Design a binder for this molecule. Structure first.
Ligand SMILES: Nc1nc2c(ncn2[C@@H]2O[C@H](COP(=O)(O)OP(=O)(O)O)[C@@H](O)[C@H]2O)c(=O)[nH]1
Length: 378
C-alpha cells in the first residue's frame, strides 16, 4: 500500500528539522561567545578565533537548510529514438504528460503545488503553456511541471528526465553527463523487437566511470510485439536476458548476477499507459502489467534509499563535525573561566557554557538517531 518514496520524503523532513535547530543553536551559542569575548573585564575567556568560528558556522548552516529543502530524487531515461522513453515516463505518471515523437533536448518533469500544467525553459522564469510550446522547444533542457495532485510520484519529490535518442547524438556523451550527474537512477529503455546496441552501452560505460556505482535499470519495452507466442516468448526473453545480464554484471560490473534479476524487465509501456489513463487484452497483458508494477516497486525502493544516502549523508557528517567543534569551544570557555565578584560572572559564564554543550549533545543524539533510521549502516 505504501510508496517507498515516502522514505525519502520522511528523511528530508527530519534533516530539515534538525538543521533548523542547528542554525538556531549555533546562533544562540554564537552570541554567547561574542558576549564573553567582548566583555572588557574578561581576560581571554573566549578568543576572537572562537568567535570567527561560530560566525562562520552560522553563515554556513542557513544556506544548508536552504538547499536540502530543494533536494529531490531524480530518474533519467536513455535509449534509441523510438524505444518508448516518453511512454515509460507517461506510464509512471498515470497520464500522457509528455508526447511521443520529436525534439532534441532534455525534458525534466517536476511537481507543482499549483494546479495547471506548464513549462519553463532556460534562463527565463516565464511560465509558458504545457503542450503547445512542446513541439517548438552545449545541452538543452526544457522543464515540464505537472500538478502533484495528479501523480503520487511527483507529490513525493521525484523528478523524471527524458533525454534525446542516444542513437542520434554524439558531440559525445558529455553534456548529457552533466545533465545526469544529479541522477540517482538511470533507466535504459531498450526496444525488444531489436537487440541491445553498443551506442547505448557506451553511454553507460561513460556514466559508469565518471560516477561511482550507479543504479541502472534495463527496460525491454515493446514486449507486446512478442506476445501470443508463449514459447517463442520464452526463448526471446532468454536471449535478451543473457545480453542484458552480461552488460550489467560483466561489462559494467555494476551489479552481481542475482541482483541483476531485479534490474531487467520486459514491459509494454503503451499497455500500462492505456490501463492507467483509463481509470476515467492481448495475451499476457496482466502479466506484462504486473511486471511493470514490480519494476516500479523495486525502482522506488532503490531510488529512495540511494538518494537519501547521496544527498543527505555528507551534510549529516558535516553537522556532526560542526557540533563537535562547538563542544570544544564550549569546553575551552568553561575551562578558561575556571582559572572577587568577577567570580560570579565567570560561574555564570560556566553555567551557560554547560547549557550550550548539553544542547550540542542533544542535537548530536538526533543526528545519530537520523543516521540510524536513514543511513545504514551507521
Ligand atoms: N506497440 C507498442 N508501441 C509502443 C510501445 N511503447 C511505445 N510505443 C510507440 O512507439 C512510438 C515511439 O515511442 P516513444 O514513447 O515516443 O519513444 P521515445 O521517442 O524514445 O520517447 C510511439 O508511437 C509509441 O506509441 C509498446 O510497448 N508497444
Amino acid at each position: 500500500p505504501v510508496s517507498p518514496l515516502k522514505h525519502f520524503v520522511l528523511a528530508k523532513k527530519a534533516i530539515t528539522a534538525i538543521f533548523d535547530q542547528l542554525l538556531e543553536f549555533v546562533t544562540e551559542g554564537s552570541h554567547f561567545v561574542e558576549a564573553t569575548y567582548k566583555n572588557p573585564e574578561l581576560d581571554r575567556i573566549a578568543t576572537e578565533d572562537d568567535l570567527v568560528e561560530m560566525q562562520g558556522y552560522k553563515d554556513k548552516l542557513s544556506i544548508i537548510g536552504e538547499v536540502l529543502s530543494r533536494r529531490h530524487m531524480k530518474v533519467a531515461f536513455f535509449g534509441r529514438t523510438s524505444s518508448g522513453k516518453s511512454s515509460v515516463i507517461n506510464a509512471m505518471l498515470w497520464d500522457k504528460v509528455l508526447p511521443s515523437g520529436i525534439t532534441n533536448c532534455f525534458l525534466s518533469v517536476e511537481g507543482t503545488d499549483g494546479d495547471k500544467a506548464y513549462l519553463m525553459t532556460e534562463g527565463s522564469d516565464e511560465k509558458k503553456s504545457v503542450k503547445t510550446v512542446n513541439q517548438l522547444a552545449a545541452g538543452c533542457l526544457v522543464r515540464v511541471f505537472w500538478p502533484k495532485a495528479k501523480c503520487a510520484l511527483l507529490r513525493d519529490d521525484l523528478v523524471l528526465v527524458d533525454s534525446p535518442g542516444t542513437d542520434v547524438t554524439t558531440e559525445l556523451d558529455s553534456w548529457i553527463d552533466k545533465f545526469c550527474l544529479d541522477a540517482d537512477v538511470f533507466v535504459l529503455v531498450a526496444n525488444s523487437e531489436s537487440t541491445l546496441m553498443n551506442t547505448e552501452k557506451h553511454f553507460f560505460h561513460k556514466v559508469n566511470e565518471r560516477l561511482s556505482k550507479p543504479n541502472i535499470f534495463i527496460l525491454n519495452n515493446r514486449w507486446d510485439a512478442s506476445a501470443s507466442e508463449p514459447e517463442y516468448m520464452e526463448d526471446v526473453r532468454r536471449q535478451h536476458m543473457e545480453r542484458c545480464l552480461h552488460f550489467l554484471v560483466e561489462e559494467l560490473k555494476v551489479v552481481n548476477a542475482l541482483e541483476a534479476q531485479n534490474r531487467i524487465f520486459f514491459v509494454s509501456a503503451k499497455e500500462v499507459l492505456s490501463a492507467r489513463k483509463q481509470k476515467a487484452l492481448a495475451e499476457g497483458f496482466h502479466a506484462r502489467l504486473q511486471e511493470f508494477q514490480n519494476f516500479e516497486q523495486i525502482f522506488e525502493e532503490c531510488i529512495s534509499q540511494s538518494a537519501v544516502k547521496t544527498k543527505f549523508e555528507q551534510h549529516t557528517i558535516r553537522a556532526k563535525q560542526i557540533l563537535a567543534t562547538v563542544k570544544n569551544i564550549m569546553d575551552s570557555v568553561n575551562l578558561a573561566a575556571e582559572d572577587p565578584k568577577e567570580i560570579d560572572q565567570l560561574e555564570k559564564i560556566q553555567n551557560n557554557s554547560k547549557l550550550l554543550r548539553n544542547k550540542a549533545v542533544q542535537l548530536e543524539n538526533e543526528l545519530e538517531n537520523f543516521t540510524k533510521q536513514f543511513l545504514p549502516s551507521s
